[PDB]
């Protein structure tokens, strides 16, 4: 099986937002709108905004899941490499095999799907705080794109789904991710190649 990556705003007008961090060679996380691609360093905070036109019901949740972008690899479960799954960098909540973690949210839940064996991490969808127009989730990616025996230089996508208390689909967005040592330089390079 293969999770859908089809963009779907749904009844609440769900969509993602990214900060504008630039491409200085020191930047740790940067988003390219032209490529729809997030570039980030290993295990660094990746701020992802959640935008809605109207408030979804209490019990609404937000799930993040990675799949391989290339169709010939799409049935492969995206997981941490044989090295990183064993480096004992557990935050006490995320299984060591999970590529994507949520940072600073004790209500985060991590799922090993009993049928697809795919990994995901889901949190309650919270309203914007006072004087804010959106909510922000902080993600960490726990492997390099280049990791041998894992992603192995294959591009991935992160799929973000808004779901109801039963886990039914309310909204979906997605973005490509590259976890690398120099996100700012790699963004400039890929944007140049695109041009
Ligand atoms: Zn790795």
Q: How far, in Å, from the CA of 96 to the mean position of ligand 1?
A: 11
Q: How far, in Å, from the CA of 14 to the mean position of ligand 1?
A: 32
- CATH number reported for the structural domain that contains residue 53 in this entry: 2.60.40.720
Number of structural domains (the chain) is 1
Residues 15 and 22: their CA atoms lie apart, in Å, by: 22
On the 0-12 / 13-18 / 19+ scale of CB atoms within 10 A, 119 is: buried
CA of residue 113 relative to chain centroid, distance:
17
Q: How far, in Å, from the CA of 164 to the mean position of ligand 1?
A: 33
Please answer whether residues 52 and 58 qualify as being in contact, where contact means their C-beta atoms are separated by less than 8 angstroms: no
Strands 37-40 and 169-179: parallel
The residues pairing with 82 across neighbouring beta strands, listed in sequence order, are none
Residues 163 and 99: their CA atoms lie apart, in Å, by: 21
Q: Residue 112 belongs to what domain range?
A: 1-195
Q: What is the resolution of this structure in A?
A: 2.1
Residues 125 and 114: their CA atoms lie apart, in Å, by: 24
The response to whether 46 counts as a known ligand-binding position is: no
The response to whether 147 counts as a known ligand-binding position is: yes
The response to whether 81 counts as a known ligand-binding position is: yes
Method for this entry: X-ray
């Amino acid at each position: 099986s293969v999770p859908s990556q089809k963009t779907y705003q749904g009844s609440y007008g769900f969509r993602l937002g990214f900060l504008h961090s630039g491409t200085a060679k020191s930047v740790t996380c940067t988003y390219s709108p032209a490529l729809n691609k997030l570039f980030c360093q290993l295990a660094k905070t990746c701020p992802v905004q959640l935008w809605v036109d109207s408030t979804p019901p209490p019990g609404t949740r937000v799930r993040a899941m990675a799949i391989y972008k290339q169709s010939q690899h799409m049935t492969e479960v995206v997981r941490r490499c044989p090295h990183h799954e064993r480096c004992s960098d557990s935050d006490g909540l995320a299984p060591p095999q999970h590529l994507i973690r949520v940072e600073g949210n004790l209500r985060a839940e991590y799922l090993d799907d009993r049928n697809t064996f795919r990994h995901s991490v889901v949190v309650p969808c919270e309203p914007p705080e006072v004087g804010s127009d959106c909510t922000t989730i902080h993600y960490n990616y726990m492997c390099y794109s280049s990791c041998m025996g894992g992603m192995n230089r294959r591009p991935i996508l992160t799929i973000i789904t808004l779901e109801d208390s039963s886990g039914n689909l309310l909204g979906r967005d997605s973005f490509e991710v590259r976890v690398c040592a120099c996100p700012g330089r790699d963004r400039r390079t890929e944007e140049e190649n695109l041009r």
